[PDB]
From a paper:
The axial structure consists of three morphologically distinct regions, the rod, the hook, and the filament from the proximal to the distal end, with a few minor components. The function of the hook is a universal joint that transmits motor torque to the filament in any orientation relative to the motor axis. The rod is a drive shaft that penetrates the peptidoglycan (PG) layer and the outer membrane and connects the hook with the rotor of the motor. The distal rod and hook show distinct mechanical properties, although they share the same helical symmetry and repeat distance and are composed of similar subunit proteins ([name] and FlgE) with 39% sequence identity.
Here, we have constructed an atomic model of the St-rod structure on the basis of the crystal structure of a core fragment of St-[name] (FlgG20) solved at 2.0 Å resolution in combination with the previous cryoEM map. The crystal asymmetric unit contains two FlgG20 molecules, mol A (80–224) and mol B (72–227), whose structures are almost identical to each other with a root-mean-square deviation (rmsd) of 0.60 Å for Cα atoms. The N-terminal 33 and C-terminal 3 residues of mol A and 25 residues of mol B were not traced because of poor electron density. FlgG20 shows a single domain structure composed of 15 β-strands and the loops connecting the β-strands, and is similar to the D1 domain of FlgE except for the absence of the triangular loop and the conformation of the N- and C-terminal regions. FlgG20 more closely resembles Cj-FlgE than the core fragment of St-FlgE. The β-stretch composed of the N- and C- terminal chains of FlgG20 (N85–T89 and Y218–T221, respectively) fits nicely on the corresponding regions of Cj-FlgE. Although the homology model is similar to the D1 core of the FlgG20 crystal structure, the crystal structure includes a part of the region connecting D0 and D1 that was not present in the homology model. The C-terminal region of FlgG20 comes close to the N-terminal end of the C-terminal D0 helix of [name] in the previous rod model. The N-terminal region of FlgG20 goes into the edge of the elongated density that was not assigned in the previous model.
Numbering used by the authors: 80 to 224
Amino acid sequence: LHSQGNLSQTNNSKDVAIKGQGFFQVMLPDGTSAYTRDGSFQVDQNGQLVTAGGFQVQPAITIPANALSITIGRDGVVSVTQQGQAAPVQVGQLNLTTFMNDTGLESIGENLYIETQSSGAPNESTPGLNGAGLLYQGYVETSNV
């Protein structure tokens, strides 16, 4: 496995902590894939869900421009609320990617990591299944691991 950090509650909807194994998958500015535990989410200039570093989550998730709030469930379901509408509208699925050897991941800076020969191939799964951890919106993973 890898070293889990302690989950502190911030109540910020942008913060999504991972409880257990897995990394968020993002697309680097050059088109390649990277991975991170930094669940600090955002909406880029075209409604795409991105991380704190500004990197688009992979696969792409589009947030409607009229979305009032974004909810990310423990299973990774991404939904939004819209004015006067009672039911939440699901807009995407946030996946968690696991590796055989997290130590083998290469740091590329900004809390991002990429797949290496030592890390093994990525295993993309739903949060909660196949060893992948769970997502806790409003929580941060503290670096005091």
